[model samples]
Target chain A: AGERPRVGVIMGSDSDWPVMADAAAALAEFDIPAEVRVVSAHRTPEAMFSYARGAAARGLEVIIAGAGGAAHLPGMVAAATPLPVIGVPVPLGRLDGLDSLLSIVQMPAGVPVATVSIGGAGNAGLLAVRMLGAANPQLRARIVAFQDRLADVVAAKDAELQRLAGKLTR
Target chain B: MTPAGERPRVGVIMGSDSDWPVMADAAAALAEFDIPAEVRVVSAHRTPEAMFSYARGAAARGLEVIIAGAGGAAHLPGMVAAATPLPVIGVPVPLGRLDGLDSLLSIVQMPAGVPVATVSIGGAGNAGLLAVRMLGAANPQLRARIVAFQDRLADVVAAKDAELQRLA
Candidate 1:
């Protein structure tokens, strides 16, 4: 059989694609197969339910959902599927996506939506990779390498800041 | 009220008296800067009328800033922002579950007309510091204090970074 998508990237509207694209890109960086789509929680409730209910059976190990304003897609999807769902709080014009963040993250006790910061779709994809890495040794090694690069970047920034401070003192 | 019996210029409020432990940091931060603040329990859900009344009359009562803390479906901050024109700072008090995330969302996600400047979960100290920064906007002396505080923070971070480098 052809390579099956291990991850699903979904958004409330096509407008959210700009922000949600980062998630898909992150998955691509790891050579992970992903299926992207518009699965609205309000506009097309049945479609959203059908997608989530059938996700695991269709070979999706993780789902990344992004939505803005009264964002309910991530939480609702988590409710239906046993797979881990990562939420991206897409920033809308007002309140800077605080409402979206709340709606996705504050899911009831039973259903948990692993939420990243507002407008953090990249982290959402990276989080999914980490989740999948738990069972795969190769993916786990890649994540460790990725984390090492992050630390090196931070160290470089710190060195530059120190140099700037020293110059200002003179 | 301060032990010196000074009139409070800041108002620190929470949904219940039990919140005092978490909210006391705000009061302490205010006290550190000699900013007298009065603390109280005013629930948005349990006593809607009182919450409205307090917010409505805050400015007239000589309060320049209000720090409201609440947990889970926390409506106190938003409701207070709705009633008052004075700058309101919201501190999301963490509940037994959700780690105060629910409180954070409820307070930060206000309607268009009203705005609640929200801090982190269990971030009462920052709430008080933010209140000082708002008040400092008009008072040069207070603003200078904030600058000095920022310098101290930077110095501490630099020192920690240096220590880490030495170990490495």
Candidate 2:
């Protein structure tokens, strides 16, 4: 039996490996398998396009693309495919993540890219899993249970936050 | 050439026109597209009541989109979202602390049901284009044209990179 990747990960550089690890960890928490790759939008345009176009054919349900300054990986990949592309703008350079964030999210019209917060790879991975979970019952249930768990975690931290700030919600 | 009939599409509004110079990129970007833009000051912190009212009425006031820029605990867009379903773009003005990072995080992290599609910190231009994209979603030709523009962006960058490679 051929096991096609249910999820795909593409980053602009090796440095992103560390940042994107959070996303991979997030997927692991959800029991979703992701195939990660490093293909730069600026350095390797051809490979980026092919990976995006071949996503559905390769059985990749979603793609998580991480890149820094003038981050074109997410948008370019999105242009080549309709699968939901979650962009994670890694903080890079002196300007911090500002340049990378804008470059990834400020996509032109017609083509839409769903972007996450700067260096929000963890959220991006979770969003990808949620997107897939929309169709899968077991994953959907898990996500709901995860939400409850999140609430409990927040409750657990609420006492500490109140003690520190004298306010529960900030 | 065409005038009068056009109303401000980008709506480069801020907590204060004091932010005019900074928020002007949004206005200029819209002008490049022939989208009429007018600026106004709607401070969320200074005048919370007025801010809520303005946001509640933005969509009905002949405005296609609203751009709200503010510094420090930027809650204008989120508060406005609590009032109207019309999309709000928040621009985190450079502030005393966090270099506007706090404002950016505060605005971008809206709850799931009420989504505030925020742009980069001070990247008011992105907010303007995003509004254009939202409006262009219904207009096929314009959307196609903008998509082409995005490609042209890549082409221009590639050309520049080639030049740099040769020079360096």
Report lDDT (Cα) of residue A167, candidate 2. 24
lDDT of 2: 0.77
- Candidate fnat values, all: 0.00, 0.00
Model 2, DockQ value? 0.02
Model 1, span A12-112: residue lDDT tens: 99999999999999999888999899999999999999999999999999999999999999999998999999999887878777788889888877899
Per-prediction backbone clash count: 0, 1
| Cα-based TM-score, every candidate | 0.51, 0.52
List interface RMSDs for the candidates, in order: 19.0, 19.3
**Which one wins on lDDT?**
1
User: Which lDDT tens digits does candidate 1 get at residues B71-106?
Assistant: 978999999988999889999998754578878989
Task: Encode model 2's per-residue lDDT on A1-170: one tens digit a residue.
Answer: 23456878789999999999888889878878788899788998998888999898878888899998889999999999988888998888657787888898888888888898777889888899889889889989998898766645544443342233222111
Which pairs of residues clash in candidate 2, taking residues 3 or more apart in a chain or in different chains?
A: B8-B36
